[PDB]
Design a binder for this molecule. Structure first.
Ligand SMILES: *[C@@H]1O[C@H](CO)[C@@H](O[C@@H]2O[C@H](CO)[C@@H](O[C@@H]3O[C@H](CO)[C@@H](O[C@@H]4O[C@H](CO)[C@@H](O[C@@H]5O[C@H](CO)[C@@H](O)[C@H](O)[C@H]5NC(C)=O)[C@H](O)[C@H]4NC(C)=O)[C@H](O)[C@H]3NC(C)=O)[C@H](O)[C@H]2NC(C)=O)[C@H](O)[C@H]1NC(C)=O
Ligand SMILES: CCCCCCCC/C=C\CCCCCCCC(=O)O[C@H](COC(=O)CCCCCCCCCCCCCCC)COP(=O)(O)OCCN
Ligand SMILES: CCCCCCCC/C=C\CCCCCCCC(=O)O[C@H](COC(=O)CCCCCCCCCCCCCCC)COP(=O)(O)OCCN
Ligand SMILES: CC(C)CCC[C@@H](C)[C@H]1CC[C@H]2[C@@H]3CC=C4C[C@@H](OC(=O)CCC(=O)O)CC[C@]4(C)[C@H]3CC[C@]12C
Ligand SMILES: CC(C)CCC[C@@H](C)[C@H]1CC[C@H]2[C@@H]3CC=C4C[C@@H](OC(=O)CCC(=O)O)CC[C@]4(C)[C@H]3CC[C@]12C
Ligand SMILES: CC(C)CCC[C@@H](C)[C@H]1CC[C@H]2[C@@H]3CC=C4C[C@@H](OC(=O)CCC(=O)O)CC[C@]4(C)[C@H]3CC[C@]12C
Ligand SMILES: CC(C)CCC[C@@H](C)[C@H]1CC[C@H]2[C@@H]3CC=C4C[C@@H](OC(=O)CCC(=O)O)CC[C@]4(C)[C@H]3CC[C@]12C
Ligand SMILES: CC(C)CCC[C@@H](C)[C@H]1CC[C@H]2[C@@H]3CC=C4C[C@@H](OC(=O)CCC(=O)O)CC[C@]4(C)[C@H]3CC[C@]12C
Ligand SMILES: CC(C)CCC[C@@H](C)[C@H]1CC[C@H]2[C@@H]3CC=C4C[C@@H](OC(=O)CCC(=O)O)CC[C@]4(C)[C@H]3CC[C@]12C
Ligand SMILES: CC(C)CCC[C@@H](C)[C@H]1CC[C@H]2[C@@H]3CC=C4C[C@@H](OC(=O)CCC(=O)O)CC[C@]4(C)[C@H]3CC[C@]12C
Ligand SMILES: *[C@@H]1O[C@H](CO)[C@@H](O[C@@H]2O[C@H](CO)[C@@H](O)[C@H](O)[C@H]2NC(C)=O)[C@H](O)[C@H]1NC(C)=O
Ligand SMILES: *[C@@H]1O[C@H](CO)[C@@H](O)[C@H](O)[C@H]1NC(C)=O
Ligand SMILES: *[C@@H]1O[C@H](CO)[C@@H](O)[C@H](O)[C@H]1NC(C)=O
Ligand SMILES: *[C@@H]1O[C@H](CO)[C@@H](O)[C@H](O)[C@H]1NC(C)=O
Length: 1395
């Protein structure tokens, strides 16, 4: 505390504190007195800096918990540092000046500034893949600087000698090997071993030991992942169950292919002859790839099958199983490990479509249902559980921080001082001159007028630059020339014209003036290069003007807030993410550098894309693996690198990166968040229409009354709704038979023609009855009738058109597509549908408020893309060589390859998706944001060259940055904003109603809370014992945990048994393993029998016992089936369907492991919140399929359209919609409907129906796909929200926590002390002394006897006090009216009263 210490004062205390073992002592719970934990300022008592007393050891003026032999020092920033004043043997004592010099070296900030200048330097020189040798010398220097950093600490803190040593801190040795390796090579000669010295990357983790904010956020992440549990166990268990299921369905099923016909051996020792070619052996014909058939349009082996729904190849080929697995042989169902990888592939949702088609072709259509299950249980439920647990773990930290902060709180900037000379020179800008115009301008700035017009100037100009298309043929080039000048001048006119009105002493107030000044300086500086027309990209920074439309917007400021939060408030975590990405990008190169040298050997040395021979491609590949695409680049491993390393690298990258990104996303969100009926109508204008209120005392008025009552009776009857439902369902189903059957069958044609007419007749009759039953109240008190009217009018129009032979015109024939709206009339006839639509219609403003912002933000980047990439995507190609581009020595520009068109084999093509207009830019950006189909777009962009020039390989490798920026800005923050607004409005909507009852019907609302509880009364124990020899010990056998040990042992051994399975194996193991199966079934059956009469016949309860009989029956009937039908086995499908019954008997272990029960419970409580959403999704999908079958019937089979995936029939349309409902690839489906060119479109087509051509109309297709994508996303988001919230609803925890059972014992003992009289009346005059013996008094003692009279102690009869009026009074003193034990006790006391 003071300047210096004496030699004896320290001894005076270090001798006294050492006497604890002898005299000091013959509860502490050490805590930082003022949250002192080093590396923190924490001014506690002084609050001011000393004169010169800082920087020296102190005696720690606090409790003697940190005095001992240690001391505390502070730097110029009052940073606490604790050191130990101990020796290091030999001639070394703390009373030396060298230790003081070391403290001065260490505490001061200067030291930090040195070390950083090294670390970042060392982060550059290891970024090269071929360094010159003289870099060894720089390495030398680096080593020295780290020797220093170590030596001062080693001398100051001690190696491991006494306490607070160098190695006591866990971080200090994390770089200890740094000092080893750099010396190890110096004295020890090195061998000829590679794959070594990639350890240097560990060095850059020292950056964390420097910026303390990084250490705090690292600790927070570690705590979150240590609080995340009881999810991975469910994930691996469910994945293993699904893998076991799939190993029994698609085994060996991915090698089916059809080969050119096998003829015979021709009756000799052996000769396989075919078209004059001879083969020696069968394996030389079955394993020869020259006989394989290739799927035209791609590069792979066609798959096939013998099934009735599998498909066939052209004639001359026979289907069979032979060869190797497809796609480099890394996808398989032959063994458990490959099935496990395939399912983890499905879990993450990447490159599924292809696997889906490959499995579907060989298995057949009927197996699609399997995938339908695997997605739903896989992608949604587990991911929701992970998100919920992470969210809770993060909320806890903020809550604890706020609580601790509240508890703790409850306990000049003039360095130069020259600018003031300007303050006494400025301000008075009026001068002797002015005194008129100055106030004139100040008045002329009119907020209700000028502030509006300037706003229009910002708007109109932003639209004027949207007309920047391709080949104006001028007129627009000079018109934009004039406009961008007039607009810039008007915009910058007020720049300095506002100074006279607003004194420059107040020139800068809020910073919006700073932003406007920066924009003006931008424009002026840009308009400084007129001598040239080149460098037009320079003129693109004017799109910054669009941010001026921020001050008049209620949600753009919101966005600017989120942005600011992420950059600065959350910088401490984004820097960590950047460091992690850099570390992984560097380590990948060192791990797999020298492996792609031999990957060329073609086309004069071109290299395949996405390599790791350079830093930029490493960053790109890490970005892709962080964006959720990893199979495509993983499959480039296992070929050069091997199987043992790429797997681990990719898997840990996936975990680390996804966890960090999700935590940052949640952090950013939480930061940003903080009797006569009515005749016509009311008594208004009806005073001039005595048209219904007429005399009814005679015949003329009875008609209206009787007709209205009869119609009312008709509509209320339930059988009328039954009739309506049946007709509506039949109407919806009738439309499913409009496929190519129309020109193939005849009676179904006449049937449907009659049916449509009768349907329209009945519907119009409904409408006529409706317009009378309820008067005119409808259409104005219930809007649902508007949809009915808008639908029925369509059919009436078509009927009147076709009746008179006037429906041969295109507008009328095209009106037949509006019949696809027929199923929508059933939306209002079911309760769950009404609930979900009424809940969904409550967020349209929420949708629009994000739609506007996203639209503007995306237009900003669309304009840039148009200005950069326009007019560079064309090329010319040879017909017979496919669509591949040519070289750059024969053709250079479009005119040249059009002039070389002498043979007619040269054709000009343009990329389907381009940047030639704003609209196409919108479509391209939508494709890039969704992550499907962007590869070809970036292939076009990277390969770009000058205007109208043939592309060259990788001429501009830096175009990736623009797409990277757009993905990071248009996907992360947009999702943030959308989630924020939708959740906020949805919760406010729930808050308005008063309860949590949303998405539930009237019965479900009550059943959800009626069928959910969590309480127990008294379970017991039965065990018959009229025979002490057998069952008395059977009871001991069952009650012990040895029964649990037996069950787990047996089921785990069966698990291990059923983990030996492969393809066709030697018969010896086939039979022995069947012996093992028989033994396991027998021992399980024996265990279920030995259960016997332990509970007699009273064990048939809800406990987990009847499932023993269930599994015994199922397993025995699935196992003895082989003996039942031993005669023949000709059912290579149904037998396998029975054999899955072994999947069971493995779900018996969910009975245990209590923690894997509540999560499952929440799901069964949550399914009814998903049924209605599934129904709505089904209806939407059916409507879209019906609409889609009508326009794409004859689209050419190109790209994703094949024989098994088209729109010719209902089934194929449903399959395609199922494929695209999750946006799992739609570019390949949209692609073959944009073709219009004669090369790609045959106008004349000899079809067999009322249609011509095989190419669709894009103007319908783009809308059809975009609307489905957006609707599917909205519904999936709603399902996500419901599932997450249901998992938070199950957090009751100590909702009751009675613990009241124990107490009744003292009351019963007092009763026994009071029982023999059996009067049940007590007097307080004796209870005053009686209650003093209460064990741990929960009631009144003797001094409190006077108060007991006033606390529920009634006097009845002759001033008598009842005992039954005291039990609940005592009970509520600890707990009451909350727990189930209290309610049971009070009800038992009431029953005793009734007794
Ligand atoms: C769709 O419908 C198709 C009907 O046209 C159907 O093809 C039929 O499939 C059956 C069963 O899959 C096949 O029956 C063949 O019958 C012959 C004569 O009995 C048998 O050939 C023997 O096969 C064994 C292998 O199981 C050979 O042993 C070893 O084979 C390997 C590889 O072939 C080779 O190294 C050697 O040949 C030998 N090993 C050694 C060390 O020597 C055995 O040699 C031959 N026999 C002879 C004389 O060579 C066998 O039962 C079977 N042949 C097979 C399976 O290759 C046959 O393909 C079709 N039926 C007929 C009557 O011709 C097709 O399978 C259906 N689609 C699907 C997906 O199932
Ligand atoms: C974070 C890291 C924090 C520190 C952790 C590990 C570093 C361990 C460094 C070595 C410490 C060894 C101390 C030790 O053995 O002390 C001995 C302690 O003996 C005891 O009575 C044991 C008491 C155990 C209490 C808990 C000790 C925990 C030690 C860290 C784990 C002293 O005996 P001795 O003088 O060697 O004579 C022995 C025969 N009578
Ligand atoms: C999302 C809303 C967009 C809907 C489609 C708008 C344009 C569809 C195509 C109409 C033609 C078109 O783009 O015209 C172009 C005009 O640019 C536009 O798309 C208009 C700009 C609209 C700004 C935002 C509203 C120029 O075509 P050209 O080169 O003269 O031939
Ligand atoms: C993550 C934040 C902290 C930025 C860190 C960036 C630097 C650590 C790295 C990243 C990219 C590196 C550059 C990538 C490429 C080169 C080219 C290189 O010279 C060559 O042209 C190499 C020969 C060849 O191109 O084949 C000189 C170093 C330099 C500028 C590198 C210097 C170090 C840089 C700037
Ligand atoms: C080959 C060698 C160099 C590998 C070295 C790696 C590990 C030994 C290091 C690297 C990061 C370290 C961790 C970084 C941060 C923390 C959080 C930190 O959290 C706390 O301080 C919590 C409160 C408490 O002290 O109990 C505890 C130590 C720990 C797990 C560290 C333990 C040691 C780790 C795992
Ligand atoms: C967690 C982040 C921050 C860093 C991850 C780094 C690892 C991916 C790297 C760093 C050092 C590498 C190791 C460096 C040296 C070797 C020795 C090498 O030994 C052998 O087996 C070669 C000889 C033989 O095959 O017999 C095997 C690879 C291995 C373990 C490497 C595996 C990959 C490691 C662990
Ligand atoms: C596609 C990848 C990048 C994940 C994007 C996250 C979203 C799927 C959204 C949908 C529902 C959201 C959750 C809805 C409700 C909650 C509860 C509440 O805490 C606010 C955040 C959180 C976890 C949300 C986190 C982000 C979620 C999971
Ligand atoms: C979003 C991108 C396109 C901006 C490109 C330029 C930026 C690198 C710079 C240029 C001018 C800078 C601005 C200049 C002046 C200010 C005022 C400054 O105000 C204050 O510090 C106090 C604010 C208050 O009084 O509350 C805040 C930062 C800000 C907006 C700066 C933010 C960063 C800007 C926009
Ligand atoms: C803006 C954010 C999203 C960038 C994130 C990645 C950066 C940390 C790294 C990755 C690749 C690096 C680049 C790799 C190679 C070059 C060499 C060299 O390039 C040029 O010749 C200039 C190109 C330019 O103007 O960007 C200058 C540094 C640069 C752009 C590097 C700068 C730093 C980059 C962009
Ligand atoms: C400034 C704000 C408003 C928008 C930021 C958008 C960036 C993502 C864009 C705008 C300017 C672009 C740069 C403009 C010019 C070039 C030079 C270009 O280099 C060449 O063309 C070299 C070949 C040659 O010309 O000989 C490489 C891309 C790069 C760095 C571009 C990379 C992407 C940038 C940074
Ligand atoms: C475009 O493709 C055709 C067809 O492959 C190429 O024509 C080749 O050469 C003559 C014509 O000069 C044909 O008779 C041959 O059949 C073709 N193949 C071979 C191997 O000669 C033609 O050269 C290609 N390029 C151009 C510019 O037409
Ligand atoms: C068939 O040919 C093989 C080898 O060519 C020969 O070993 C075998 O004996 C022949 N079988 C006969 C001749 O029956
Ligand atoms: C391409 O393959 C399909 C297979 O369904 C076939 O129908 C078609 O004829 C093939 N194309 C040509 C040009 O033969
Ligand atoms: C090719 O083999 C199949 C197999 O059934 C057969 O039906 C067909 O006739 C064979 N083709 C010829 C040309 O013999």
């Amino acid at each position: 505390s003071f300047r210096r210490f004496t030699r004896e004062s320290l001894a005076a205390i270090e001798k006294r504190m050492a006497e604890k073992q002898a005299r000091g002592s013959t509860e502490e719970a050490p805590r930082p007195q003022l949250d002192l934990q080093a590396s923190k300022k924490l001014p506690d008592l002084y609050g001011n800096p000393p004169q010169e007393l800082i920087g020296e050891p102190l005696e720690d003026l606090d409790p003697f918990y940190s005095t001992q032999k240690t001391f505390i020092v502070l730097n110029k920033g009052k940073t606490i540092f604790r050191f130990s004043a101990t020796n290091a043997l030999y001639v070394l004592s703390p009373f030396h000046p060298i230790r003081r010099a070391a403290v001065k070296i260490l505490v001061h900030s200067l030291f930090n500034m040195l070390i950083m200048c090294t670390i970042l330097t060392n982060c550059v020189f290891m970024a090269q893949h071929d360094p010159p040798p003289w870099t060894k010398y720089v390495e030398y220097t680096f080593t020295a600087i780290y020797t220093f950093e170590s030596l001062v600490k080693i001398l100051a803190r001690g190696f491991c000698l006494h306490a607070f040593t160098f190695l006591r801190d866990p971080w200090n040795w994390l770089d200890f090997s740094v000092i080893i390796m750099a010396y190890t090579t110096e004295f020890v000669d090195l061998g000829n071993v590679s794959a070594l010295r990639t350890f240097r990357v560990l060095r850059a983790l020292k950056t964390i030991s420097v910026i303390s904010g990084l250490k705090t956020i690292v600790g927070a992440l570690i705590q979150s992942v240590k609080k995340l549990a009881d999810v991975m166990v469910l994930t691996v268990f469910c994945l293993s169950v699904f893998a076991l299921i799939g190993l029994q369905l698609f085994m060996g099923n991915l090698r089916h292919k059809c080969v050119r016909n096998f003829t015979a051996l021709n009756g000799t020792n052996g000769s396989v002859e075919a078209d004059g070619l001879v083969w020696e052996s069968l394996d030389l014909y079955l394993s020869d790839p020259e006989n394989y058939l290739l799927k035209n349009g791609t590069s792979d082996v066609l798959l096939c099958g013998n099934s009735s729904d599998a498909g066939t190849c052209p004639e001359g080929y026979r289907c069979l199983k032979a060869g190797e697995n497809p796609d480099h042989g890394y996808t398989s169902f032959d063994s458990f490990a490959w099935a496990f990888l395939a399912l983890f592939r499905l879990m993450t949702q990447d490159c599924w479509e292809r696997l889906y088609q490959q499995t579907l072709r060989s298995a057949g259509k009927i197996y699609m249902i399997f995938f339908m299950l695997v997605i739903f249980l896989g992608s949604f439920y587990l991911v929701n559980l992970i998100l919920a647990v992470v969210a809770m773990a993060y909320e806890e930290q903020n809550q604890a921080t706020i609580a601790e902060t509240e508890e703790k709180e409850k306990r000049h900037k003039c360095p130069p001082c020259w600018n003031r000379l300007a303050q006494r020179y400025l301000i008075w800008e009026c001068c002797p001159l002015w005194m008129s115009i100055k106030q004139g301008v100040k008045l002329v700035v009119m907020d209700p007028f000028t502030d509006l017009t300037i706003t229009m100037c910002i708007v109109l100009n932003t639209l004027f630059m949207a007309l920047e298309h391709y080949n104006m043929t001028s007129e627009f080039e000079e018109m934009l020339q004039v406009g961008n000048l007039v607009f810039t001048g008007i915009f910058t006119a007020e720049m300095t014209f506002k100074i006279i009105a607003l004194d420059p002493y107040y020139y800068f107030q809020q910073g919006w003036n700073i932003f406007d000044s920066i924009i003006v300086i931008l424009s002026l500086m840009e308009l400084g290069l007129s001598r040239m027309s080149n460098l037009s990209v320079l003129r693109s920074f004017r799109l910054l003007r669009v941010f001026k439309l921020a001050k008049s917007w209620p949600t753009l400021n919101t966005l600017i807030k989120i942005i600011g939060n992420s950059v600065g408030a959350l910088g401490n975590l984004t820097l960590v993410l950047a460091i992690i990405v850099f570390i992984f990008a560097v380590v990948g190169m060192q791990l797999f550098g020298k492996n792609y040298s031999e990957l060329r050997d073609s086309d004069s040395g071109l290299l395949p894309r996405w390599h790791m021979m350079d830093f930029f491609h490493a960053f790109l590949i890490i970005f892709r693996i962080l964006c959720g695409e990893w199979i495509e680049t993983m499959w480039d491993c296992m070929e050069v690198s091997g199987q043992s390393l790429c797997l681990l690298v990719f898997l840990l990258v996936m975990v680390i990166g996804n966890l960090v990104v999700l935590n940052l996303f949640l952090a950013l969100l939480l930061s940003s968040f903080s009797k006569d009926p009515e005749d016509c109508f009311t008594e208004g204008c009806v005073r001039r229409c005595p048209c219904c209120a007429v005399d009814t005392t005679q015949a003329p008025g009875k008609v209206w009354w009787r007709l209205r009552k009869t119609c009312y009776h008709i509509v209320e009857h339930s059988w009328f709704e039954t009739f309506i439902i049946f007709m509506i369902l039949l109407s919806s189903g009738a439309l499913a038979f409009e496929d190519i059957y129309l020109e193939e069958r005849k009676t179904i044609k006449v049937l449907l023609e009659y049916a449509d007419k009768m349907f329209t007749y009945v519907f119009v009759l409904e409408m006529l009855l409706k317009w009378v039953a309820y008067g005119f109240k409808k259409y104005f008190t219930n809007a649902w009738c508007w949809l009915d009217f808008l639908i029925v009018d369509v059919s009436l129009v078509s009927l009147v058109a076709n009746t008179l032979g006037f429906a041969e015109m295109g507008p009328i024939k095209s009106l037949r597509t509006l019949r696809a709206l027929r199923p929508l009339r059933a939306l209002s006839r079911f309760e769950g549908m009404r609930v979900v639509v009424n809940a969904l219609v409550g967020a349209i403003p929420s949708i629009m408020n994000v739609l506007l912002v996203c639209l503007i933000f995306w237009l900003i980047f669309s304009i840039m893309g148009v200005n950069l990439f326009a007019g560079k995507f064309g090329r010319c190609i040879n017909q017979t060589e496919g669509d591949l581009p040519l070289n750059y020595t024969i053709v250079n520009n479009k005119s040249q390859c059009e002039s070389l068109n002498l043979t007619g084999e040269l054709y000009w093509t343009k990329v389907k998706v381009n940047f030639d207009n704003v609209g196409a830019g919108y479509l391209a950006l939508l494709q890039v944001a969704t992550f499907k189909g962007w590869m070809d777009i970036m292939y076009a962009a990277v390969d770009s060259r000058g205007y109208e020039e043939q592309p060259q390989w990788e001429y501009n490798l830096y175009m990736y940055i623009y797409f990277v920026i757009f993905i990071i800005f248009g996907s992360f923050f947009t999702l943030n904003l959308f989630i924020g607004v939708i959740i906020d409005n949805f919760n406010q909507q729930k808050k308005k109603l008063g309860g949590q009852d949303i998405f539930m019907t009237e019965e479900q609302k009550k059943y959800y809370n009626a069928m959910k509880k969590l309480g127990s009364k008294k379970p017991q124990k039965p065990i018959p014992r009229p025979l002490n020899k057998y069952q008395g010990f059977i009871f001991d056998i069952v009650t012990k945990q040895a029964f649990d040990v037996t069950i787990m042992f047996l089921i785990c051994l069966n698990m291990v048994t059923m983990m030996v399975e492969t393809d066709d194996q030697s018969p010896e193991k086939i039979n022995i393993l069947a012996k093992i199966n028989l033994l396991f079934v027998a021992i399980f059956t024996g265990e279920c029998i030995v259960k016997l009469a332990a509970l007699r016949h009273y064990y048939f309860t809800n406990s987990w016992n009847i499932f023993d009989f269930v599994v015994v029956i199922l397993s025995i009937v699935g196992t003895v089936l082989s003996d039942i039908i031993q005669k023949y086995f000709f059912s290579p499908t149904l037998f396998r369907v029975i054999r899955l019954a072994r999947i069971g008997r493995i779900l018996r272990l969910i009975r245990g492991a209590k923690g894997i029960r509540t999560l499952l419970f929440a799901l069964m409580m949550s399914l009814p919140a998903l049924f209605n959403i599934g129904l709505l999704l089904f209806l939407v999908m059916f409507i879209y399929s019906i609409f889609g079958m009508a326009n794409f019937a004859y689209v050419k089979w190109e790209a994703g359209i094949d024989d098994m995936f088209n729109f010719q029939t209902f089934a194929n349309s449903m399959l395609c919609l199922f494929q695209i409902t999750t946006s799992a690839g739609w570019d390949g489906l949209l692609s073959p409907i944009l073709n219009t060119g004669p090369p790609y479109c045959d106008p004349t087509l000899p079809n067999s129906n009322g249609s011509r051509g095989d190419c669709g109309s894009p103007a319908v297709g783009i809308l059809f796909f975009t609307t489905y994508i957006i609707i599917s996303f909205l519904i999936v988001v709603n399902m996500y929200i419901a599932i997450i919230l249901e998992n938070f609803s199950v957090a009751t925890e100590e909702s009751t926590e009675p613990l009241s059972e124990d107490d009744f014992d003292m009351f019963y003992e007092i009763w026994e002390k009071f029982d023999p009289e059996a009067t049940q009346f007590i007097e307080y005059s004796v209870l005053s002394d009686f209650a003093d013996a209460l064990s741990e008094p929960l009631r009144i003692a003797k001094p409190n006897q006077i108060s007991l009279i006033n606390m529920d102690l009634p006097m009845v009869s002759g001033d008598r006090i009842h005992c039954m009026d005291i039990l609940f009074a005592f009970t509520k003193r600890v707990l009451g009216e909350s727990g189930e034990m209290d309610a049971l006790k009070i009800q038992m006391e009431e029953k005793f009263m009734a007794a």
